[PDB]
Amino acid sequence: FKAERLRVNLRLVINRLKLLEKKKTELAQKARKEIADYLAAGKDERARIRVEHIIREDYLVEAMEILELYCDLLLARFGLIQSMKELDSGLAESVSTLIWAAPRLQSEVAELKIVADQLCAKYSKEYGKLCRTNQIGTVNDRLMHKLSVEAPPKILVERYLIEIAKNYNVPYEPDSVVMAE
């Protein structure tokens, strides 16, 4: 385990997350316009897939915001990392989430895997790849939900479509079966 390596990788992860969330917000605007165009036509069951894409990306942007927050938290309390040998309570959440989410966002942010390495190679109490996955039952549940790979609720998709239609001056008749239940 190297400390300065972890510091540099944390700063890089922060910068990368900033860039990614910016450009993802922009792409989300453009793809929302695309969904509005799709709704202009009679194609409805396809706009639901497109808006699934959109809300997945939005969950992802929120999760990246949370991860940037946690990385900056670790970077603000880095000396408290170097001094102690076991992490305190103030850093349990950050370390846990940054180790749990690394394989999730490993493709988007590469340096995150190095951060996970330095945070797994520094600890031995319930640590190590195997024990690091075993002791991952203390991560932020909200971030787990944002990065949860699951079909979003249908009613949520209908609400997303209703709002986009209402904004882009396009008519849309929600599926009452899901819109009312």
């Binding site: 917000t25 939005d58 949520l156 986009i164």
Partner: peptide
């Protein structure tokens, strides 16, 4: 915005939401 300003200046015509979507995401 640039297109809107240029149109309005020329007098012719051409032929926010994120917060509501976030509030909806909070559920």
């Amino acid at each position: 915005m640039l297109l809107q300003e240029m149109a309005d200046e020329a007098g012719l015509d051409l032929n926010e939401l994120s917060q509501r979507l976030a509030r909806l995401r909070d559920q």
